[model samples]
Target: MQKTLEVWIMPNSPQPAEDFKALVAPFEKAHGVEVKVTVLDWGVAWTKITTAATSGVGPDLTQLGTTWVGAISAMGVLEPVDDVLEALGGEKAYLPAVWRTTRLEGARQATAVPWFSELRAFYYRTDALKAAGVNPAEMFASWQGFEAGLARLKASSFRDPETKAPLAPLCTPGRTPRTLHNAAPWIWGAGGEIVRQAGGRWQSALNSPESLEGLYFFLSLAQKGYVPAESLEKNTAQIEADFQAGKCAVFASGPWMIQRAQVPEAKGGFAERTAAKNLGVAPYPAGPKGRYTFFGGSNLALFNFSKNKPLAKELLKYLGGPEAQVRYAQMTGMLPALRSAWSDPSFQQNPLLRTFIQAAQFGRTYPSLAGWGGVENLAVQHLGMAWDLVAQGRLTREALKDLMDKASAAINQALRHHHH
Candidate 1:
């Protein structure tokens, strides 16, 4: 009988299943094994993955987001891959920031191996800024300069060449899955943390002075009309579309946009237009404490229930290895988790890609607590309302402080209960 492996992943590209099939072709030929790939929607992935984790009856290998590792690893349905990590050159071979997310908080061994890493950065229009007399370097050098640049763009007569309509300063969505992910850089840059372990106990810090300060600056962008207040009702897709259509001058997104922007407009891309030509990637401006960005990506785990453990382990080795890492990145326009993959000319030759690799150095993700997944969800839910208030220009510093304080207390209570 022929062996078959079921591999699942959230959509990493416009054609992920097809792309994954293309990526694994060489491996399939080399190993003479059948590989099946399933693409899960991000919206439904958690529930489906959770169901699979509890039932122990899902893919032989599944891709888990960095933050999701804790909750899923706690389920104990994953096969520990310590030996495999060693064979693949271990933690030292991968991006140090992402390697920290491969295991549960206190686990002695890793349950997964990182597949790809993505760090967030600001994406702006060089042409628009230049036309508006805004210096890109000065704009991204500090928080005050960034906001000032936004005001300059809003006040300038810089119009879309094709549409002749004024461009907004920013294109961030007010309520999307990225609400927390996007806001994290501001929070972290201000020397704030969403949650941290201290005195041998996990606690939420959303109410801390540093956290509030960071949140205030971020919300004020919307409140001051730098970004369209109507963005409060939009999702990431809408904002991306608006940016691509030349309705907005800047936005923040992952590396995939670098590739997506290159596709011809006929194929649902802005390659032929200003969005692609004028696109610029930059690290977030420095806050009072430091510069930081949200670092995250996906990891591949072998299921304990997989009958093809040996073959699956081989696939894991292949995927996490440098060759496949580069190939997967080229196919999906994602950053490889393996540090050595950066040496590939394919990555080195692209100027935009270089920005991402450089920015990855200052990237950070949430702590690897077993309850972090819950903490993140709670955060999105709580701060989501605060975003509404900000959009309406009703979020005073006092109101923001009260909101953060209540959110921090609630998260701390839940985390304590989970650990106890």
Candidate 2:
């Protein structure tokens, strides 16, 4: 008898329907199993999946975003994968960082298995730094040194030949979802997380000393004329273009931008006359406490209602195994979730790819709380508003602290406190 499994994947998957067929072809032939797949838009996936979960009817397996882990696991719809891990080899089979997301707030059992992931890193031009009299190797060791070096970069003669205005030392988005990504390292470097459970109570740590200090330091850099006044209006694509065009001394982004920069027209203007050695990458600059990058991605989950329970587990084992993982990375251009996957020849040989791998090790994600998404939506708008206020001298550091205090309170109120 043939074992068939139904899998529901989200839209924008790196692996398309044809690619997915090829991915599972080996398993299908060897195990005599039939695998059918469905892809859904992310906009409607949550509602659709939740409705199915509530009705006790859904695909045998599903793809989930990182934020959904907390809420979905809390819903008690996913099968605990401890048995799957034991059968597949053990807990160490997956990357430690991505593996941790399988449970709600570090429970004894896992709710999901990691599929793919992404993180950001700082990217710069090698020649631009030397002309500005800075060596990142030496400067990155200390934030004060790095800030000083950037100040010098701001002082340097790099400018738009057409507009004659000073180019920004750093290119960053003024709005989110990336506004938070770019700002997270600063908050983390100061040794505070945005939100966490403390003493059995949900609380916001953004107003804490370290986080506030980091935010101020980051904001101060903007106030010092290092970043262009119009920068806050730019999005990720616009910022990358600015960096590529040499209008900004440095930029922060994920692996996809590295791929984009190689194309001539896609490159801000570097494709025209820029030297070949222009692009360089480094881990995000360390905060006073440590280094950090905003980490996010997808995971594979099992539904308890699958009639073909054992077959579903086997399919999951095959899909999450190293061979399929390597293929996923090869076809999708995404960073694989397996730390050991880095040693694969394709990854080891690429300097740009290695930088993101290193950055992923330094990655930190949002607090594992259900309804945290709603909280984030609320916070992002305020965070942007506060930055604009500080930029215009309309808000003092003291005033910003009060705003952060109120914001944190509102965010904590939104948390689903079942785990706490």
Candidate 3:
């Protein structure tokens, strides 16, 4: 019972933990290889993979964040799949926005193949708004009105039946990295870049007027009492709890949560019995400049030093295949990476996934640089500091300029001195 290939994944929502083994079961039997799968959360996946990368040890195949792809590929940690890519017509079948994230920084071959893509959508409990005599469509069109609507929801007397805690209009998890990723859409919507490459140099765009405007309202959630301070230090689980317990009205997230709102058994955050009462989702609210969503999801890559390179190639190829794409979505409730798979009537008709796919068209990502991870870490650190200031009534419009200017300097310095 020797396994010929190993696989690792930073499992996404819908758990994909015990189920993925079954999802990949047939492939294992057909190939006569006992595939080894190591699943970890998104945070630990990078750390564990880095450990393996440094020790020159790793699985034959694994999932990497598209954000991590650029940095890790720059470090020569991932094997180039362009040879296999060529045979497959060189990345012809994936979403164009997501496909772009697979390319390595300053390189010829794409070091990874996208598995399934993720993006955030404006998720609101429809019944909550409708019960308050509000129209969901109107909010998407007007940002100010949107905030007003949340205030109304907060004032709607929509209290949790059990604990009687007042419901928040939005449940935002403020943890770093996740915080930075989710904030990309807001920042880009404000016509800001987390870090945009300019004249062949990295520049921090966090303090730009557009960026600050978006940042202003994002922090306003807590400032206005639509969000809580406790939620500031929350994780996905904590935020989801607020959602499931009927303590949140609107927020941004993947389609699986939308499905969870409707299908009771698939529940994580909300009650199966109640979430469907007024479930609604929309494209992220339009910013002054444009509508946006951060492109995210797992990409499969091979270690350059794998002992079973050929077998790994086969596994990677299978993971990217149309059938596997559909099955993965079916089993795990994740959005598929293969665009062709969407043509299947089952997927195309899925409103939960379809809504998110439409939103995905407006996706943007941070500049692909070897030092991007460090740049992001510093940006998140400063962004959090600014958030506290604004929420606590310390950061004012007149003074935001100086504070952001200083924050931008520190982030730019981090980017300047950053090494892969």
Give the top-scoring candidate (TM-score): 1
Which 10 residues in a row give candidate 1 its minimum summed lDDT?
411-420
lDDT of 2 by residue, 20-62 (tens): 8888999889889888988888788888888988899889998
lDDT per residue for candidate 3 within 94-130, as digits (tens), equals 6667777777655788898878877778777777787
lDDT of 3: 0.74
Model 1 whole-model lDDT (C-alpha atoms): 0.86
lDDT of each: 0.86, 0.74, 0.74
- C-alpha TM-score for every candidate: 0.95, 0.88, 0.89
Candidate 3 stretches with Cα past 4 Å from truth are 1-3, 13-17, 86-92, 154-166, 175-177, 262-273, 398-403
Instruction: Give model 3's TM-score versus the native structure.
Output: 0.89
On the 0 to 100 scale, the lDDT of residue 151 in model 3 is 78
For candidate 3, give the lDDT of residue 349. Answer: 80
**Tens-digit lDDT track for model 1 on 132-164?**
888988998899899999999888888888778
